[PDB]
């Protein structure tokens, strides 16, 4: 107890938060800060030195900087209209690490994955395509570079943390949805996306985890992101032409209680066009708003009456 509560002098008042650069096999690591102060001291307890993955933020002191510790910081067979494309992504990204009798004899291992896109986007159809991996795999989906741009300009180090947790979580499939890097400071997006491309290509890795890139348009990817970004396979999403809307709305009506009195065409094509997002919203507020009337049946005027909220929402402002 005394030996555990005696190192409090180092972690006491003279304590700071620095950024370690690398660890040397000579048991003295190198740290840094805003001005880049490099101090090497023999390591102490409470550290792992193996899973630490040097190059992150660590704990420093006002002392000689002896390291006292560290501080860390709807299935594939439900939707219709794209069964060939969903068995294409199923058969394509469910090939590695699953069904190995036809994966190791070929000996190809293209560690790149497919790149999805869709004019509707919204993550509903793309997530419905990427849901094939949720069957038998660890849930891991890095949805876009939103956390890259909403945080301080730390660079691709967060991509290195997601890549090290994806390396410690090899039986997974890294899925990326709503890529808004260049479609939406600004000069750092090109270097963190070029380092995302370099580290994504497998600069110091092999066929461990698959990467599926999904966005709103295939033309948003720069020409640099083509040859080292797409080497496995590309897809093509056609317009829903009320058939993907018919199947998605059929799934939405497979659980709720409603007759054929509700007109389909004007509601799946109410404002301009929409597959599942706001019709899923009016199905949610249709079950809740229909539940307000203490009736499970969907009234012909309450469904369109709740639809007036979404129709008026995106048109007023």
């Amino acid at each position: 107890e005394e030996e555990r509560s005696k190192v409090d002098d180092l972690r006491g008042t003279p304590m700071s938060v620095g950024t370690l650069e690398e660890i040397i096999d000579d048991n003295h690591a190198i740290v840094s800060t805003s001005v880049g102060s490099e101090h090497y001291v023999s390591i102490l307890s409470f550290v792992d030195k193996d899973l630490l993955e040097p190059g992150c933020s660590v704990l420093l002191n006002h002392k000689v900087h002896a390291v006292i510790g560290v501080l860390m910081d709807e299935t594939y067979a439900d939707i219709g209209g794209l069964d060939n494309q969903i068995q294409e992504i199923k058969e394509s990204v469910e090939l590695p690490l699953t069904h190995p009798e036809y994966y190791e004899e070929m000996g190809i291992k293209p560690p790149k994955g497919v790149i999805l896109y869709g004019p509707p986007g919204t993550g509903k159809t793309l997530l419905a395509k990427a849901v094939a991996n949720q069957t038998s795999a660890t849930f891991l989906r890095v949805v876009g570079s939103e956390l890259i741009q909403k945080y301080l300009g730390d660079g691709p180090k967060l991509v290195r943390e997601l890549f090290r947790v994806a390396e410690e979580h090899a039986p997974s499939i890294v899925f990326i949805d709503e890529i808004d890097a260049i479609g939406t400071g600004e000069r750092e997006i090109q270097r963190t996306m070029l380092e995302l491309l370099n580290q994504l290509d497998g600069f110091d890795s092999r066929g461990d985890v698959k990467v599926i890139m999904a966005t709103n348009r295939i033309e948003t990817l720069d020409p640099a992101l083509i040859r080292p970004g797409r080497i496995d396979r590309k897809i093509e999403f056609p317009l829903p032409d009320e058939k993907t809307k018919k199947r998605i709305f059929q799934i939405h009506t497979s659980r709720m209680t409603l007759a054929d009195d509700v007109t389909l065409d004007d509601l799946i094509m109410a404002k301009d066009d929409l597959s599942g997002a706001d019709i899923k919203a009016i199905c949610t507020e249709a079950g809740l708003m229909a539940l307000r009337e203490r009736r499970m049946k969907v009234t012909n005027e309450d469904f369109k009456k709740s639809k007036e909220n979404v129709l008026y929402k995106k048109q007023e402002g």
Partner: protein, 636 residues
């Protein structure tokens, strides 16, 4: 004049707004008189909750005919409404349930049987206590005896262990004629009691000679032994490789596990000679018993394959050869005399190791008394060798598993008095309670736990025997007092009754495996982390279990690194060899290597599957137990 109308209106408004006891009184005094909407309103929900609170208040308050007439009127009324699950699950707690079910089970077979027996059997083994489950077994014996779907009545024979049920299902399964399959799970479902009682009443009549033909021996495996050679094909790269990376005089023991539990092909079995000679003494027992473990078929071939090792020049070759004779069969019992007759040596001779293999393999073959009278000078001998009383207590225990409310006779009284005779070699106080608890198995209302709490209460050796009787005395019921008592006594200073008493969790709540994972691993008592590590079990091995093996797999002590591959390979029988490559990354001592390869071969309430590992929980000892490590019978 028409006061039932005013009582009906009074119970209508009092039942309409709120009341807890005043609702059914106008109905029990009203004498109800005088499929519709109103009938469903005042009968279905108002008489469902009405009769529910009347049966609850009159069932918990007093313990008349009014509640019987109202409860049978609800029985017929809900037989017209035809909602079995909700109405039945509400009228469970008010035999009344027997006459109710046989009063309802006329036309609906799959609804009341599948639904009522599914959710009421699951909730009956989870929450309902035993004395009502006995009514489930008797009334289910009735409605399932008069109806079809025999195998669920065979499950009623697994829970009842009655010979009239298997006799009636043999004359009823014989009157209505697969054969070999129902013999397979017939013998798998029956325990030690009703297969010898079955072989004695069927030794009496059997009416076709096919019950003594089928349900004696070799016919649970005669449908599976040839098919497994035909429908499956194993490669030689495991014999050459797994038989090639062996060295250091312990991976050769792992190669005795290769030969013993490698199975189609018999190449490594006859790969020259001197393999058994190069091995150690306990590896000569394991290697001598390997040919017995690979020959659970072809008795005539087993005799001509083990006869070469019989009466050989070495003691462990013939003793392990008698162990092989005990493993090859379980209904032949013809190899008894050549080993049973020579047992009388009593000090150090060959009959002590031939007593290990012959009493152990004979216990696997067997509840005959004569063998126990022959084992009386064995338990009274008390040799310095532990495995003598080890396989003796485990042998007579496996003979006595599933007895009628147990027994406190001079067998366990004799091994308790002779257990407390000398207070040396505590391993006796660690394996004798195993056989004791095996004799305690099969009880339904026995007071043997309190009797042991009266006589056995002593220093923590026989008190550890007492908590072992507490382990085997809690096979499972609705007794959550043992769960709060488990959490209360879980913090005991004694670091072994935590291991066994807390290790009982994988057996008590074995069926409802959703509650087995808990916060036991978050403590600092790494022994409790081993308790959860064993508490994973042998199930399908979902992602949560392997998630627990991801943290339990990485440890420095050889007891946890040695204890992880056993459950890691028993619970899982690009995802099979990958954790083994993880073991290759962790290691590259010898214990975790022999246990990680032995886990490679491991990967590739029946007492036969609950006894060998619960007795195997004492591996943290010398290599003497390693001669018994490979001959476990829990492996199908």
């Amino acid at each position: 004049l028409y006061r039932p109308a005013l009582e009906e209106l009074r119970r209508q408004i009092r039942s309409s707004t709120t009341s807890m006891t005043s609702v059914p009184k106008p109905l029990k005094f009203l004498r109800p008189h005088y499929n519709k909407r109103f009938a469903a309103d005042i009968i279905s929900v108002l008489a469902m909750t009405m009769s529910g609170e009347r049966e609850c208040l009159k069932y918990r308050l007093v313990g008349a005919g009014e509640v019987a007439k109202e409860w049978q009127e609800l029985d017929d009324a809900e037989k017209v409404q035809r909602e079995p699950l909700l109405t039945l699950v509400k009228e469970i707690v008010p035999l009344l349930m027997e006459i109710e079910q046989v009063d309802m089970l006329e036309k609906d077979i799959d609804e009341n049987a599948y639904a009522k027996v599914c959710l009421y059997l699951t909730s009956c083994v989870n929450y309902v206590p035993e004395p009502e489950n006995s009514a489930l077994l008797r009334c289910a014996l009735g409605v399932f005896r008069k109806f079809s779907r025999f195998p669920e009545a065979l499950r009623l024979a697994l829970m009842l262990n009655d010979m009239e049920l298997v006799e009636d299902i043999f004359t009823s399964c014989k009157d209505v004629v697969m054969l070999g399959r129902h013999g397979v799970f017939l013998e798998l479902s029956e325990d030690v009691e009703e297969y010898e009682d079955l072989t004695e009443i069927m030794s009496n009549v059997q009416l076709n000679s096919n019950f003594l033909a089928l349900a004696r021996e070799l016919d649970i495996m005669e449908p599976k032994v040839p098919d497994d050679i035909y429908k499956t094909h194993l490669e030689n790269n495991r014999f050459g490789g797994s038989g090639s990376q062996v060295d250091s005089a312990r991976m050769n023991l792992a190669s005795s596990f290769v030969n013993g539990f490698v199975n189609q092909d018999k190449l490594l079995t006859d790969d020259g000679n001197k393999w058994l000679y190069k091995n150690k003494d306990h590896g000569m027992l394991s290697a001598a018993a390997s040919l017995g473990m690979i020959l659970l078929w072809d008795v005539d071939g087993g005799l001509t394959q083990i006869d070469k090792y019989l009466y050989s020049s070495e003691d462990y070759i013939k003793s392990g050869a008698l162990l092989a004779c005990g493993i090859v069969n379980s209904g032949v019992r013809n190899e008894c005399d050549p080993a049973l007759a020579l047992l009388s040596d009593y000090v150090l001779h060959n009959s002590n190791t031939m007593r290990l293999g012959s009493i152990f393999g004979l216990g696997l073959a067997y509840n005959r008394e004569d063998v126990l009278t022959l084992l009386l000078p064995v338990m009274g001998d008390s040799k310095s060798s532990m495995e003598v009383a080890g396989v003796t207590a485990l042998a007579c225990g496996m003979i006595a598993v599933g007895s009628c409310n147990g027994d406190v006779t001079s067998t366990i009284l004799q091994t308790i008095m002779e257990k407390s005779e000398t207070e040396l070699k505590d391993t006796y106080a660690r394996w004798l309670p195993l056989g004791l608890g095996l004799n305690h198995l099969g009880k339904g209302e026995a007071i043997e736990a309190i009797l042991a709490a009266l006589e056995v209460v002593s220093e923590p050796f026989r008190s550890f025997a007492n908590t072992l009787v507490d382990v085997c005395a809690y096979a499972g019921s609705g007794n959550v007092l043992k769960v709060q008592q488990l959490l209360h006594i879980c913090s005991e200073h004694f670091d072994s009754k935590e291991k066994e008493e807390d290790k009982d969790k994988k057996e008590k709540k074995d069926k409802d495996k959703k509650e087995a994972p808990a916060d036991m691993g978050a403590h600092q008592g790494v022994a409790v982390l081993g308790i959860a590590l064993i508490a994973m079990g042998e199930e399908i091995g979902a992602e949560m279990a392997l998630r627990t093996f991801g943290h339990l797999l990485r440890y420095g002590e050889p007891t946890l690194r040695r204890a992880v591959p056993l459950a890691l390979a028993l619970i899982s029988v690009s995802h099979d060899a990958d954790p083994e490559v993880s073991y290759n990354s962790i290691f590259a001592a010898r214990l975790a290597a022999m246990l990680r390869q032995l886990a490679q071969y491991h990967a590739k309430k029946g007492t036969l599957t609950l006894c060998p590992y619960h007795s195997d929980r004492q591996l943290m000892s010398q290599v003497a137990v390693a001669g018994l490590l490979t001959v476990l019978v829990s492996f199908l």
